[PDB]
């Protein structure tokens, strides 16, 4: 019943080992009440390895790179006093993980008391007990200050994980003496600025001073600039209980006030915390697991599952008001009619995650795709022709590449009635871009194999959308162009197998058709972003059949796949050409199903996600967190990719809006989307004796793995709804239809699935 207790919100919160947050948050919540460590932090604002905390920020992004996004609206409890804008060093409180507790919807910590005046503020006797919880749009605070303290909360509106652009604060003192603060914060992350409106009320009487960009702390009730803030001071008689409620809205301050009355009403802190815990239990309860001692002797694998299921329901965030409105990239308010509008995208990294969301929470997935459609429809509506990067966004956000694939994913899966798809389409076309004249002639971008394979997948996705809109002729042209990267950039005999077999591989190609020299295993060679040619080779996952042919046939592919995973040298870390640390070749472990060796897919799926593997590659050039260089672990390292630890992922391995977590869930269920933008899932190695996904109507998908253990991870035989099943892929319809997929597991590889009906490929469909 209480799945929330199995989630460990600290997994991935250390250093550069995931960039996730312990923040109090509701499922897909906008409000993310994250403690802030000092002087070090991860991208979210909390590094587990630290021992001081300043306060709580209310906005954020999960698992992103750079210096993180959001981090707006810092609330810092203190017994100190100020006569000017606070020095940030004065916020610092000792904390200990021994006096810290968190889980779905809540975070609590005992902070060492601090007192004094301005720069003289330092440690003081006693403890500030801090508790926060979250609803969808709101963060609530309860503080206990030592007896005799003059409690104060600093509301710092400059704090941002990357860049504060503008902020404002208006103060109101009501009849009962409580204070309400409101205004806007405008930040920036990666491509775009974003604005959020806020309202924050105290629950006890307070007096207040504000500051603006001149650093003067004054009695004025309004500020508007870049660095602004407010300092709330309470009566010592209220030291036992200081409460604060903060609500966010992409729409307006007054909308935030309405949202707050709707969301929180007169509910107590405990009831708001309790209600969000129940909401998490309902969300997590969509997947019910029975895991024997044999497969999970310590219970950590089940905790790991639920922790990553928790992480899967974070982004995109609910960007809709309680009144059913949202703010568009045109800067105006619009109705999200009959659906919830979500926003905050990092689709270049995360596109495969949506395909998995589709089979865990179909209704949420539908709303997300509809939202993605409205977002592009809105860009088109401006009439400006500009890219999404040129607008101010409704929530912190990242990037939008591969959106065409995600939309196509819902269409291929039989979702329809997507309002405003006709409007979204031309904006999706501009996103994807066109080959230049010279590029059209030759069939590829000169010296840029990465951009070529990427457009190929984008064009496949657009082609699905084109056919749905009845643009048949456009769809044909798109499919033709989408075939080009495979045909034109797979260089024959790029790699020669041990027995002489000639294997073709993605290789940069000059304008005149000459092949360009390249080490196919070198990180970021040939203009590639965050990967190698071997890793990008497999990118055009919508046409494995054409890829197998371009590679030089079945045997060439089969031997290539074996070499990709160093099968000929299992104890040599350097022979590992696959990367676990980035999303570029996420699907690669499941490609053995395509080379007639499904047992190897099963092995690698179970190994990468639940065992120690060889790791040659990190996700970036180098990292101070592990001896590394040139995009590699130096030397290669045998280690678990996923740990139930604050050091949750490999060093440099960012979750990226819950992508790595979502892939873990998919591996655990045993169904992986090699082809996002299709309706198919590839069979892996289900982790648990029984896994049940219950849909909103009470029907359920049940996948069983009879006799599964840490050693018994190979499929021996299978049935589908009682009947012999021999395919290594299943359709989305079969899953959400409530099928019974039953596997028989064993400790040795079998030939199960080696006579599979072919999986989807654009060229053979
Ligand atoms: Ca990444």
mmCIF file of C-alpha atoms in Angstrom, residues 211-583:
data_model
loop_
_atom_site.group_PDB
_atom_site.id
_atom_site.type_symbol
_atom_site.label_atom_id
_atom_site.label_comp_id
_atom_site.label_asym_id
_atom_site.label_seq_id
_atom_site.Cartn_x
_atom_site.Cartn_y
_atom_site.Cartn_z
ATOM 1 C CA UNK A 211 15.622 45.464 -0.778
ATOM 2 C CA UNK A 212 16.370 46.361 -4.392
ATOM 3 C CA UNK A 213 19.494 46.633 -6.532
ATOM 4 C CA UNK A 214 21.147 49.344 -4.406
ATOM 5 C CA UNK A 215 21.346 46.811 -1.540
ATOM 6 C CA UNK A 216 19.414 49.165 0.797
ATOM 7 C CA UNK A 217 17.110 47.423 3.266
ATOM 8 C CA UNK A 218 14.123 49.722 3.572
ATOM 9 C CA UNK A 219 10.545 49.988 4.798
ATOM 10 C CA UNK A 220 9.168 50.411 1.242
ATOM 11 C CA UNK A 221 6.527 47.842 0.334
ATOM 12 C CA UNK A 222 7.445 47.461 -3.390
ATOM 13 C CA UNK A 223 10.572 46.572 -5.370
ATOM 14 C CA UNK A 224 11.120 45.872 -9.047
ATOM 15 C CA UNK A 225 14.530 45.147 -10.590
ATOM 16 C CA UNK A 226 16.966 42.234 -10.715
ATOM 17 C CA UNK A 227 18.251 41.649 -7.166
ATOM 18 C CA UNK A 228 15.221 42.167 -4.915
ATOM 19 C CA UNK A 229 14.034 40.580 -1.687
ATOM 20 C CA UNK A 230 12.050 40.803 1.533
ATOM 21 C CA UNK A 231 12.822 40.025 5.177
ATOM 22 C CA UNK A 232 9.982 38.860 7.418
ATOM 23 C CA UNK A 233 10.373 39.292 11.185
ATOM 24 C CA UNK A 234 8.113 37.513 13.689
ATOM 25 C CA UNK A 235 7.329 37.875 17.393
ATOM 26 C CA UNK A 236 9.480 35.747 19.771
ATOM 27 C CA UNK A 237 6.184 34.370 21.145
ATOM 28 C CA UNK A 238 5.663 32.551 17.809
ATOM 29 C CA UNK A 239 9.110 30.930 17.786
ATOM 30 C CA UNK A 240 7.528 27.469 18.352
ATOM 31 C CA UNK A 241 5.671 27.644 14.983
ATOM 32 C CA UNK A 242 6.453 29.802 11.951
ATOM 33 C CA UNK A 243 4.460 28.873 8.815
ATOM 34 C CA UNK A 244 4.705 29.993 5.194
ATOM 35 C CA UNK A 245 2.783 29.062 2.056
ATOM 36 C CA UNK A 246 4.168 29.787 -1.412
ATOM 37 C CA UNK A 247 2.221 29.219 -4.642
ATOM 38 C CA UNK A 248 3.487 29.574 -8.253
ATOM 39 C CA UNK A 249 1.620 30.412 -11.460
ATOM 40 C CA UNK A 250 2.781 30.945 -15.036
ATOM 41 C CA UNK A 251 -0.305 33.153 -15.453
ATOM 42 C CA UNK A 252 -0.388 35.907 -12.796
ATOM 43 C CA UNK A 253 -0.051 36.831 -9.181
ATOM 44 C CA UNK A 254 -3.810 36.835 -8.776
ATOM 45 C CA UNK A 255 -4.061 33.437 -10.451
ATOM 46 C CA UNK A 256 -1.426 32.203 -7.930
ATOM 47 C CA UNK A 257 -3.650 33.527 -5.084
ATOM 48 C CA UNK A 258 -6.679 31.688 -6.458
ATOM 49 C CA UNK A 259 -4.580 28.527 -6.955
ATOM 50 C CA UNK A 260 -3.445 28.829 -3.359
ATOM 51 C CA UNK A 261 -6.996 29.079 -1.990
ATOM 52 C CA UNK A 262 -8.050 26.118 -4.193
ATOM 53 C CA UNK A 263 -5.019 23.939 -3.445
ATOM 54 C CA UNK A 264 -4.412 24.677 0.236
ATOM 55 C CA UNK A 265 -7.589 26.344 1.582
ATOM 56 C CA UNK A 266 -7.439 26.223 5.399
ATOM 57 C CA UNK A 267 -5.767 22.808 5.459
ATOM 58 C CA UNK A 268 -2.998 22.303 7.997
ATOM 59 C CA UNK A 269 0.641 21.583 7.094
ATOM 60 C CA UNK A 270 0.203 17.907 8.128
ATOM 61 C CA UNK A 271 -2.889 17.466 5.916
ATOM 62 C CA UNK A 272 -1.203 19.047 2.889
ATOM 63 C CA UNK A 273 1.854 16.805 3.434
ATOM 64 C CA UNK A 274 -0.381 13.765 4.000
ATOM 65 C CA UNK A 275 -2.472 14.441 0.884
ATOM 66 C CA UNK A 276 0.589 14.675 -1.347
ATOM 67 C CA UNK A 277 1.905 11.387 0.113
ATOM 68 C CA UNK A 278 -1.412 9.736 -0.845
ATOM 69 C CA UNK A 279 -1.273 11.261 -4.310
ATOM 70 C CA UNK A 280 2.231 9.705 -4.668
ATOM 71 C CA UNK A 281 0.956 6.335 -3.437
ATOM 72 C CA UNK A 282 -1.785 6.398 -6.101
ATOM 73 C CA UNK A 283 0.765 7.325 -8.796
ATOM 74 C CA UNK A 284 3.334 4.735 -7.679
ATOM 75 C CA UNK A 285 0.528 2.185 -7.132
ATOM 76 C CA UNK A 286 0.002 2.080 -10.904
ATOM 77 C CA UNK A 287 2.840 -0.483 -10.833
ATOM 78 C CA UNK A 288 2.622 -3.311 -8.291
ATOM 79 C CA UNK A 289 5.611 -5.571 -7.847
ATOM 80 C CA UNK A 290 6.153 -9.004 -6.328
ATOM 81 C CA UNK A 291 9.930 -9.527 -6.006
ATOM 82 C CA UNK A 292 11.241 -12.792 -4.479
ATOM 83 C CA UNK A 293 14.375 -13.162 -2.375
ATOM 84 C CA UNK A 294 15.891 -14.932 -5.396
ATOM 85 C CA UNK A 295 15.868 -11.836 -7.642
ATOM 86 C CA UNK A 296 16.094 -9.182 -4.867
ATOM 87 C CA UNK A 297 17.731 -10.703 -1.759
ATOM 88 C CA UNK A 298 18.250 -7.315 -0.007
ATOM 89 C CA UNK A 299 15.074 -5.508 -1.124
ATOM 90 C CA UNK A 300 17.191 -2.747 -2.753
ATOM 91 C CA UNK A 301 16.132 -3.572 -6.293
ATOM 92 C CA UNK A 302 12.459 -2.971 -5.364
ATOM 93 C CA UNK A 303 13.442 0.326 -3.670
ATOM 94 C CA UNK A 304 15.474 1.242 -6.758
ATOM 95 C CA UNK A 305 12.460 0.547 -8.956
ATOM 96 C CA UNK A 306 10.095 2.755 -6.902
ATOM 97 C CA UNK A 307 12.694 5.520 -6.535
ATOM 98 C CA UNK A 308 13.059 5.648 -10.331
ATOM 99 C CA UNK A 309 9.311 5.359 -10.878
ATOM 100 C CA UNK A 310 9.089 8.441 -8.605
ATOM 101 C CA UNK A 311 11.683 10.207 -10.816
ATOM 102 C CA UNK A 312 9.705 9.293 -13.974
ATOM 103 C CA UNK A 313 6.793 11.527 -12.840
ATOM 104 C CA UNK A 314 8.625 14.904 -12.669
ATOM 105 C CA UNK A 315 8.930 16.530 -16.120
ATOM 106 C CA UNK A 316 7.266 18.029 -18.053
ATOM 107 C CA UNK A 317 5.671 19.872 -15.109
ATOM 108 C CA UNK A 318 2.025 20.814 -14.674
ATOM 109 C CA UNK A 319 1.994 24.355 -16.166
ATOM 110 C CA UNK A 320 -1.815 24.784 -15.778
ATOM 111 C CA UNK A 321 -3.723 26.950 -13.288
ATOM 112 C CA UNK A 322 -6.599 25.680 -11.106
ATOM 113 C CA UNK A 323 -8.842 27.660 -13.470
ATOM 114 C CA UNK A 324 -7.706 25.547 -16.460
ATOM 115 C CA UNK A 325 -5.541 28.240 -18.094
ATOM 116 C CA UNK A 326 -1.877 28.417 -19.175
ATOM 117 C CA UNK A 327 0.467 31.054 -20.603
ATOM 118 C CA UNK A 328 1.503 30.706 -24.215
ATOM 119 C CA UNK A 329 4.790 31.668 -25.867
ATOM 120 C CA UNK A 330 2.805 34.616 -27.308
ATOM 121 C CA UNK A 331 2.741 35.985 -23.749
ATOM 122 C CA UNK A 332 -1.019 35.645 -23.460
ATOM 123 C CA UNK A 333 -3.381 33.545 -21.366
ATOM 124 C CA UNK A 334 -5.134 30.577 -23.056
ATOM 125 C CA UNK A 335 -7.545 27.808 -22.112
ATOM 126 C CA UNK A 336 -6.233 24.266 -21.726
ATOM 127 C CA UNK A 337 -9.701 22.992 -22.644
ATOM 128 C CA UNK A 338 -10.467 19.472 -21.395
ATOM 129 C CA UNK A 339 -6.835 18.559 -20.664
ATOM 130 C CA UNK A 340 -3.919 19.564 -18.459
ATOM 131 C CA UNK A 341 -1.206 21.630 -20.116
ATOM 132 C CA UNK A 342 2.324 20.470 -19.321
ATOM 133 C CA UNK A 343 5.530 22.387 -20.082
ATOM 134 C CA UNK A 344 9.332 22.111 -19.545
ATOM 135 C CA UNK A 345 11.048 20.120 -22.241
ATOM 136 C CA UNK A 346 14.512 18.623 -22.792
ATOM 137 C CA UNK A 347 13.469 16.505 -25.714
ATOM 138 C CA UNK A 348 16.921 16.163 -27.394
ATOM 139 C CA UNK A 349 17.922 14.109 -24.308
ATOM 140 C CA UNK A 350 14.661 12.620 -23.173
ATOM 141 C CA UNK A 351 12.534 11.675 -26.180
ATOM 142 C CA UNK A 352 12.476 7.909 -25.481
ATOM 143 C CA UNK A 353 11.017 8.444 -21.983
ATOM 144 C CA UNK A 354 7.585 9.430 -23.312
ATOM 145 C CA UNK A 355 7.180 6.080 -25.082
ATOM 146 C CA UNK A 356 7.467 4.412 -21.631
ATOM 147 C CA UNK A 357 5.160 6.913 -19.891
ATOM 148 C CA UNK A 358 2.619 5.853 -22.565
ATOM 149 C CA UNK A 359 2.379 2.338 -21.095
ATOM 150 C CA UNK A 360 2.535 3.340 -17.409
ATOM 151 C CA UNK A 361 0.137 6.335 -17.385
ATOM 152 C CA UNK A 362 -1.593 6.645 -20.795
ATOM 153 C CA UNK A 363 -3.805 9.642 -19.770
ATOM 154 C CA UNK A 364 -0.845 11.672 -18.529
ATOM 155 C CA UNK A 365 1.090 10.826 -21.690
ATOM 156 C CA UNK A 366 -1.831 11.944 -23.832
ATOM 157 C CA UNK A 367 -1.963 15.306 -21.998
ATOM 158 C CA UNK A 368 1.783 15.757 -22.459
ATOM 159 C CA UNK A 369 1.597 15.144 -26.217
ATOM 160 C CA UNK A 370 -1.429 17.430 -26.538
ATOM 161 C CA UNK A 371 0.558 20.047 -24.612
ATOM 162 C CA UNK A 372 3.542 19.622 -26.928
ATOM 163 C CA UNK A 373 1.144 20.166 -29.860
ATOM 164 C CA UNK A 374 -0.224 23.399 -28.287
ATOM 165 C CA UNK A 375 3.302 24.658 -27.663
ATOM 166 C CA UNK A 376 4.247 24.420 -31.361
ATOM 167 C CA UNK A 377 0.782 25.593 -32.431
ATOM 168 C CA UNK A 378 1.405 28.696 -30.282
ATOM 169 C CA UNK A 379 4.799 29.387 -31.910
ATOM 170 C CA UNK A 380 3.043 29.207 -35.284
ATOM 171 C CA UNK A 381 0.198 31.488 -34.055
ATOM 172 C CA UNK A 382 2.649 34.334 -33.265
ATOM 173 C CA UNK A 383 3.192 34.572 -37.034
ATOM 174 C CA UNK A 384 6.863 35.397 -36.358
ATOM 175 C CA UNK A 385 8.395 32.196 -37.788
ATOM 176 C CA UNK A 386 10.922 32.362 -34.924
ATOM 177 C CA UNK A 387 12.144 29.275 -33.049
ATOM 178 C CA UNK A 388 10.966 28.391 -29.559
ATOM 179 C CA UNK A 389 14.257 29.799 -28.180
ATOM 180 C CA UNK A 390 13.133 33.346 -29.024
ATOM 181 C CA UNK A 391 10.139 33.419 -26.683
ATOM 182 C CA UNK A 392 9.795 33.769 -22.930
ATOM 183 C CA UNK A 393 8.560 30.384 -21.625
ATOM 184 C CA UNK A 394 5.858 29.612 -18.976
ATOM 185 C CA UNK A 395 8.151 27.455 -16.769
ATOM 186 C CA UNK A 396 11.909 26.768 -16.688
ATOM 187 C CA UNK A 397 12.668 24.721 -19.777
ATOM 188 C CA UNK A 398 15.543 23.341 -21.846
ATOM 189 C CA UNK A 399 15.290 22.295 -25.513
ATOM 190 C CA UNK A 400 12.822 20.887 -28.052
ATOM 191 C CA UNK A 401 14.622 18.781 -30.672
ATOM 192 C CA UNK A 402 13.010 15.381 -31.448
ATOM 193 C CA UNK A 403 9.515 16.736 -30.600
ATOM 194 C CA UNK A 404 8.351 15.426 -34.033
ATOM 195 C CA UNK A 405 9.295 11.915 -32.884
ATOM 196 C CA UNK A 406 7.350 12.255 -29.627
ATOM 197 C CA UNK A 407 4.188 13.472 -31.429
ATOM 198 C CA UNK A 408 4.612 10.620 -33.925
ATOM 199 C CA UNK A 409 4.912 8.237 -30.947
ATOM 200 C CA UNK A 410 1.321 9.029 -29.872
ATOM 201 C CA UNK A 411 0.037 8.861 -33.443
ATOM 202 C CA UNK A 412 1.713 5.482 -34.123
ATOM 203 C CA UNK A 413 0.215 4.302 -30.801
ATOM 204 C CA UNK A 414 -3.331 5.134 -32.045
ATOM 205 C CA UNK A 415 -3.962 8.339 -30.077
ATOM 206 C CA UNK A 416 -6.124 10.790 -31.974
ATOM 207 C CA UNK A 417 -8.143 14.015 -31.696
ATOM 208 C CA UNK A 418 -5.038 16.117 -31.028
ATOM 209 C CA UNK A 419 -6.474 19.603 -31.258
ATOM 210 C CA UNK A 420 -4.374 22.104 -33.285
ATOM 211 C CA UNK A 421 -2.039 19.511 -34.844
ATOM 212 C CA UNK A 422 -2.513 21.223 -38.233
ATOM 213 C CA UNK A 423 -1.098 24.434 -36.641
ATOM 214 C CA UNK A 424 1.731 22.628 -34.842
ATOM 215 C CA UNK A 425 2.938 20.997 -38.101
ATOM 216 C CA UNK A 426 4.605 23.964 -39.884
ATOM 217 C CA UNK A 427 6.377 24.925 -36.637
ATOM 218 C CA UNK A 428 7.536 21.318 -36.323
ATOM 219 C CA UNK A 429 8.799 21.541 -39.937
ATOM 220 C CA UNK A 430 10.914 24.640 -39.104
ATOM 221 C CA UNK A 431 12.241 22.864 -35.998
ATOM 222 C CA UNK A 432 13.395 19.914 -38.096
ATOM 223 C CA UNK A 433 14.824 22.221 -40.791
ATOM 224 C CA UNK A 434 15.519 21.424 -44.440
ATOM 225 C CA UNK A 435 18.661 20.124 -46.122
ATOM 226 C CA UNK A 436 20.261 22.912 -48.212
ATOM 227 C CA UNK A 437 20.295 22.686 -52.038
ATOM 228 C CA UNK A 438 23.761 21.077 -52.027
ATOM 229 C CA UNK A 439 22.675 18.725 -49.228
ATOM 230 C CA UNK A 440 19.536 17.682 -51.107
ATOM 231 C CA UNK A 441 21.688 16.863 -54.136
ATOM 232 C CA UNK A 442 24.210 14.692 -52.239
ATOM 233 C CA UNK A 443 21.816 13.315 -49.589
ATOM 234 C CA UNK A 444 23.665 14.368 -46.396
ATOM 235 C CA UNK A 445 25.312 17.197 -44.431
ATOM 236 C CA UNK A 446 29.023 17.307 -45.410
ATOM 237 C CA UNK A 447 31.368 16.288 -42.559
ATOM 238 C CA UNK A 448 28.461 16.192 -40.082
ATOM 239 C CA UNK A 449 27.207 12.596 -39.637
ATOM 240 C CA UNK A 450 25.440 13.566 -36.382
ATOM 241 C CA UNK A 451 23.226 16.246 -37.891
ATOM 242 C CA UNK A 452 22.352 13.833 -40.760
ATOM 243 C CA UNK A 453 21.184 10.896 -38.606
ATOM 244 C CA UNK A 454 19.294 13.340 -36.372
ATOM 245 C CA UNK A 455 17.341 14.906 -39.230
ATOM 246 C CA UNK A 456 16.673 11.375 -40.468
ATOM 247 C CA UNK A 457 14.858 10.487 -37.253
ATOM 248 C CA UNK A 458 13.104 13.910 -37.162
ATOM 249 C CA UNK A 459 11.871 13.390 -40.718
ATOM 250 C CA UNK A 460 10.627 9.899 -39.946
ATOM 251 C CA UNK A 461 8.587 11.487 -37.092
ATOM 252 C CA UNK A 462 7.300 14.323 -39.244
ATOM 253 C CA UNK A 463 6.299 11.728 -41.857
ATOM 254 C CA UNK A 464 3.937 10.042 -39.337
ATOM 255 C CA UNK A 465 2.405 13.452 -38.493
ATOM 256 C CA UNK A 466 2.116 14.314 -42.208
ATOM 257 C CA UNK A 467 0.094 11.124 -42.982
ATOM 258 C CA UNK A 468 -2.151 11.833 -39.991
ATOM 259 C CA UNK A 469 -2.923 15.294 -41.414
ATOM 260 C CA UNK A 470 -3.620 13.755 -44.825
ATOM 261 C CA UNK A 471 -0.459 15.238 -46.374
ATOM 262 C CA UNK A 472 0.310 11.979 -48.208
ATOM 263 C CA UNK A 473 2.742 13.446 -50.745
ATOM 264 C CA UNK A 474 4.716 15.299 -48.028
ATOM 265 C CA UNK A 475 4.887 12.091 -45.994
ATOM 266 C CA UNK A 476 6.441 10.168 -48.944
ATOM 267 C CA UNK A 477 9.107 12.823 -49.509
ATOM 268 C CA UNK A 478 9.886 12.827 -45.771
ATOM 269 C CA UNK A 479 10.278 9.018 -45.661
ATOM 270 C CA UNK A 480 12.539 9.199 -48.728
ATOM 271 C CA UNK A 481 14.758 11.835 -47.062
ATOM 272 C CA UNK A 482 14.742 9.852 -43.800
ATOM 273 C CA UNK A 483 16.307 6.890 -45.631
ATOM 274 C CA UNK A 484 19.299 9.048 -46.743
ATOM 275 C CA UNK A 485 21.518 9.022 -43.603
ATOM 276 C CA UNK A 486 21.584 5.195 -43.483
ATOM 277 C CA UNK A 487 22.175 4.731 -47.223
ATOM 278 C CA UNK A 488 24.664 7.559 -47.751
ATOM 279 C CA UNK A 489 26.720 7.606 -44.514
ATOM 280 C CA UNK A 490 27.199 3.895 -43.704
ATOM 281 C CA UNK A 491 30.712 3.315 -45.045
ATOM 282 C CA UNK A 492 31.252 -0.282 -46.180
ATOM 283 C CA UNK A 493 34.148 -2.104 -44.512
ATOM 284 C CA UNK A 494 34.612 0.662 -41.899
ATOM 285 C CA UNK A 495 35.348 -2.121 -39.424
ATOM 286 C CA UNK A 496 36.635 -5.631 -40.245
ATOM 287 C CA UNK A 497 35.533 -8.525 -38.033
ATOM 288 C CA UNK A 498 37.934 -11.198 -36.652
ATOM 289 C CA UNK A 499 36.976 -13.582 -39.465
ATOM 290 C CA UNK A 500 37.325 -10.896 -42.189
ATOM 291 C CA UNK A 501 33.620 -9.962 -42.443
ATOM 292 C CA UNK A 502 33.201 -6.374 -43.708
ATOM 293 C CA UNK A 503 31.058 -4.231 -41.409
ATOM 294 C CA UNK A 504 29.688 -0.856 -42.474
ATOM 295 C CA UNK A 505 29.544 2.020 -39.979
ATOM 296 C CA UNK A 506 28.390 5.613 -39.790
ATOM 297 C CA UNK A 507 31.352 7.687 -41.037
ATOM 298 C CA UNK A 508 31.716 11.407 -41.885
ATOM 299 C CA UNK A 509 31.624 12.034 -45.644
ATOM 300 C CA UNK A 510 33.039 14.973 -47.570
ATOM 301 C CA UNK A 511 31.051 17.106 -50.025
ATOM 302 C CA UNK A 512 32.596 15.241 -53.011
ATOM 303 C CA UNK A 513 31.543 11.853 -51.584
ATOM 304 C CA UNK A 514 35.067 10.996 -50.288
ATOM 305 C CA UNK A 515 34.909 9.316 -46.897
ATOM 306 C CA UNK A 516 36.597 11.312 -44.127
ATOM 307 C CA UNK A 517 39.128 9.798 -41.734
ATOM 308 C CA UNK A 518 37.743 9.103 -38.224
ATOM 309 C CA UNK A 519 38.346 6.932 -35.134
ATOM 310 C CA UNK A 520 34.853 5.431 -34.707
ATOM 311 C CA UNK A 521 35.444 4.914 -30.957
ATOM 312 C CA UNK A 522 36.691 8.442 -30.199
ATOM 313 C CA UNK A 523 34.338 10.609 -28.109
ATOM 314 C CA UNK A 524 33.148 13.649 -30.100
ATOM 315 C CA UNK A 525 35.111 12.914 -33.272
ATOM 316 C CA UNK A 526 33.538 13.946 -36.629
ATOM 317 C CA UNK A 527 31.558 16.920 -35.225
ATOM 318 C CA UNK A 528 29.476 14.632 -32.978
ATOM 319 C CA UNK A 529 27.802 15.758 -29.772
ATOM 320 C CA UNK A 530 28.410 13.744 -26.583
ATOM 321 C CA UNK A 531 29.251 10.464 -28.342
ATOM 322 C CA UNK A 532 31.169 8.323 -30.813
ATOM 323 C CA UNK A 533 30.454 7.057 -34.329
ATOM 324 C CA UNK A 534 29.839 3.498 -32.983
ATOM 325 C CA UNK A 535 27.223 4.969 -30.607
ATOM 326 C CA UNK A 536 25.609 7.255 -33.208
ATOM 327 C CA UNK A 537 25.764 4.427 -35.797
ATOM 328 C CA UNK A 538 22.493 2.972 -34.409
ATOM 329 C CA UNK A 539 20.661 6.334 -34.252
ATOM 330 C CA UNK A 540 18.151 5.810 -37.035
ATOM 331 C CA UNK A 541 16.198 3.356 -34.932
ATOM 332 C CA UNK A 542 13.136 3.583 -37.221
ATOM 333 C CA UNK A 543 14.968 1.453 -39.822
ATOM 334 C CA UNK A 544 17.131 -1.323 -38.414
ATOM 335 C CA UNK A 545 16.371 -3.363 -41.538
ATOM 336 C CA UNK A 546 17.916 -0.776 -43.860
ATOM 337 C CA UNK A 547 20.728 -0.273 -41.343
ATOM 338 C CA UNK A 548 21.491 -4.039 -41.301
ATOM 339 C CA UNK A 549 21.658 -4.003 -45.151
ATOM 340 C CA UNK A 550 23.811 -0.856 -45.300
ATOM 341 C CA UNK A 551 26.155 -2.510 -42.761
ATOM 342 C CA UNK A 552 26.727 -5.368 -45.222
ATOM 343 C CA UNK A 553 24.004 -7.827 -44.208
ATOM 344 C CA UNK A 554 22.903 -9.914 -41.261
ATOM 345 C CA UNK A 555 26.222 -11.509 -40.318
ATOM 346 C CA UNK A 556 27.959 -8.111 -40.497
ATOM 347 C CA UNK A 557 25.329 -6.581 -38.128
ATOM 348 C CA UNK A 558 25.487 -9.565 -35.781
ATOM 349 C CA UNK A 559 29.281 -9.324 -35.503
ATOM 350 C CA UNK A 560 29.104 -5.498 -35.181
ATOM 351 C CA UNK A 561 26.683 -5.794 -32.246
ATOM 352 C CA UNK A 562 28.937 -8.313 -30.551
ATOM 353 C CA UNK A 563 31.944 -5.974 -31.031
ATOM 354 C CA UNK A 564 29.872 -2.988 -29.727
ATOM 355 C CA UNK A 565 29.682 -4.790 -26.382
ATOM 356 C CA UNK A 566 33.204 -6.293 -26.343
ATOM 357 C CA UNK A 567 31.808 -9.861 -26.356
ATOM 358 C CA UNK A 568 35.139 -11.188 -27.706
ATOM 359 C CA UNK A 569 36.973 -9.662 -24.703
ATOM 360 C CA UNK A 570 34.613 -9.672 -21.650
ATOM 361 C CA UNK A 571 37.344 -8.644 -19.180
ATOM 362 C CA UNK A 572 38.738 -5.728 -21.268
ATOM 363 C CA UNK A 573 37.097 -2.452 -20.230
ATOM 364 C CA UNK A 574 38.473 -0.765 -23.370
ATOM 365 C CA UNK A 575 36.489 -3.086 -25.707
ATOM 366 C CA UNK A 576 33.204 -1.610 -24.431
ATOM 367 C CA UNK A 577 32.001 0.661 -27.283
ATOM 368 C CA UNK A 578 28.542 1.219 -25.822
ATOM 369 C CA UNK A 579 28.057 4.066 -23.335
ATOM 370 C CA UNK A 580 25.793 3.722 -20.285
ATOM 371 C CA UNK A 581 26.346 7.325 -19.162
ATOM 372 C CA UNK A 582 24.444 9.106 -21.955
ATOM 373 C CA UNK A 583 21.229 8.674 -23.976
#
